[PDB]
Symmetry: C2
């Protein structure tokens, strides 16, 4: 038996009313499938939603430990194992997901094989093990048949564009996703829908289309019970408030911090967000990570030092950054910081260049402001604001 099955059976002997309870939490609407699941090995709910909602309602503090068990004990050729693959990737449970994936690409179900290979391409692109060209080529050679992997093959490209700072392709691509074509796996369709909400929130943020951003993050939160999507919803709301409402932005970052207490990845993410917030508002910054050589963290140190006219320290940090390789992502902020330290307009023109190149219409308000403060001609500021990059 499965740890989940063991625990449910134990807890049943002491509380019978759980059955009508669990059945309602699982959507079932008469407990026969619950009974069947508990009493017969290898039995499966029609939708992965059922066992997930049960585990979240009855054993939240154990969700990982149990589901890692359950997922890894599934027949890989089933609909439940494909649903479990998406469950793993969505929660960023990369152990469950990666093992599932190597079991799925070798197996004898065509659908599970296709899922495994596409999600494999997503994981390889995520870790910069293959190029985007190689990802597209591989996806093309798969002759994807299912609507689910038709949608996800576009989704993984969206994630890659988001994390590499290549925002201009995102809008046209996300419009191509059509989730109404998913009819066989409602768990996958609903989770993909949440993904689309968060991604559209991000696209709206990067277009400086801010009310929209927050609305789509609202929809994402209402549509999910997955911690990852809640985390990035609060991150995006708070970030959309970066230039306008200090307390509400910090409030969303602190909410996200509070729901991801034990998870160090999310913790680092919200700490970096609060650090950037305090640097934008030129306040004292207790969120700076002084024991890091990541480009983000060093940039935020330099930003703070620049804010408080600690020019020797800022110059030391920028030397550190000079000895590191930047992607086009990081370069705009690099030139913004150099421009502020050196009192230099040309640097702000370079920063604007790279914000345009990445099609980032949100953060580009930082260099523009500086040019405005330095007395830049108003019509010229309009021009720089409205032209864009090929």
């Amino acid at each position: 038996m499965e740890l989940i099955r063991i625990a449910m059976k134990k807890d049943l002997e002491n509380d019978n009313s759980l059955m009508n309870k669990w059945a309602t939490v699982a959507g079932l609407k008469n407990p026969n499938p619950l009974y069947d699941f508990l009493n017969h090995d290898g039995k499966t709910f029609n939708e992965f939603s059922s066992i997930v909602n049960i585990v979240k309602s009855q054993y939240p503090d154990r969700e990982y430990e149990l589901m890692k068990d359950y997922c890894l004990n599934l027949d890989v050729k089933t609909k439940a194992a494909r649903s479990a693959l998406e469950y793993a990737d969505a929660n960023m449970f990369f152990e469950i997901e990666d093992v599932l994936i190597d079991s799925m690409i070798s197996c004898s179900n065509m659908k599970s094989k296709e899922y495994g290979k596409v999600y494999k391409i997503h994981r390889e692109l995520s870790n910069s093990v293959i190029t985007e060209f190689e990802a597209v080529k591989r996806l093309g050679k798969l002759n994807i048949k299912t609507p689910e992997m038709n949608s996800f093959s576009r989704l993984l490209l969206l994630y890659h564009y988001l994390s590499t700072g290549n925002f201009s392709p995102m809008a046209q691509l996300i419009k191509q996703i059509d989730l109404s074509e998913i009819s066989e796996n409602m768990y996958i369709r609903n989770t993909y829908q949440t993904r689309v909400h968060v991604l559209m929130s991000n696209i709206k943020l990067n277009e400086n289309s801010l009310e929209e951003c927050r609305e789509y993050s609202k929809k994402a939160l209402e549509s999910t019970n997955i911690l990852r999507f809640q985390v990035f919803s609060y991150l995006t709301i708070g970030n959309s408030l970066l230039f306008s409402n200090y307390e509400l932005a910090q409030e969303n970052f602190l909410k996200g911090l509070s729901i991801s207490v034990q998870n160090e990845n999310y913790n680092m993410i919200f700490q970096q967000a609060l650090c950037f917030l305090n640097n934008v508002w030129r306040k004292e910054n207790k969120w700076i990570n002084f024991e890091s050589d990541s480009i983000m963290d060093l940039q935020e140190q330099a930003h703070c030092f620049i804010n408080f006219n600690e020019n020797s320290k800022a110059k030391e940090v920028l030397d550190k950054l000079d000895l590191l390789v930047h992607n086009d992502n990081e370069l705009a902020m690099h030139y913004y910081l150099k421009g502020r330290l050196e009192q230099n307009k040309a640097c702000f023109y370079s920063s604007i260049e790279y914000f345009k190149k990445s099609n980032d219409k949100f953060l580009i308000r930082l260099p523009l402001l500086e040019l405005q403060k330095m007395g830049e001609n108003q019509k010229l500021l309009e021009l720089l604001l409205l032209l864009e990059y090929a």
Copy 2:
């Protein structure tokens, strides 16, 4: 008998060797079709090229008078009348063309009707009688069947984009034209081919892609015996030399002048080209038309006055221009002239704005230069040079 036929017979009585001559000039391969044409009323050559080349070889000085007769005597349902519609439009013989068109939209031949209606939409758009939106709607409602009008419906849009200063759609649109699909009318295919040569020459000019421009105009000249296409080929070559080679630009404009002696439109066109050339090079300008209220001519008056620091006179002309309506190209040039008169950077930024909006990467060298003379930061100039309008 047609005037053409009358003259051909008259000259035949006096010179027999003309048969083998005309037959070779008409492409024929033997005089059998020539004799058929002369002996049977209303009989047509398989290609309209034949009578055109004959008239050009034997009665050049009369080409219009004869062909107007011939074209207006044609059975409108025939291939020769469709070929003659393209002949009239290509030579800008608006009398022949408009009469042909009203006769062809009324007839019972579906091909001739379609030609007539599409060319009608072209002439109405040319004369600003309908908007581009209305042209597109009417073209769509025509359910075009023939390849010829598939190509020409795009060609007329290209002409409208060129003459309104909306250059950015032109490249993608011209790439959609596929003349190899025209198999029934070789006169129309070859004349369209010349049209595409001239248009691509212009698109390359507007992209500041100059050697390419001259190559396509070179091809246009080699592909034609039609005066209108030679005129605009020489106009475009000379224009491509505007900022580099004064003598060769003037040479091409004077050539165009010399081959279009009696035609007042072409004469005005080359005089305006020479006027602009001399203003770009800040020379004495005998080519200015002081008896005009068109935007071009007034702008060149102001340009000359500004060149020679006659600021009161330039201000007077620019007052006149202020009381007139401009398109985006002409507005970019307006802000260039204002920028030079007032020595004002913001005006040059507006000029850049409208050159970008029209996707004119050639004339935009005028305001940029001035900004450079006023000491504009080079990195900023790089930025303005590389960013574009949405």
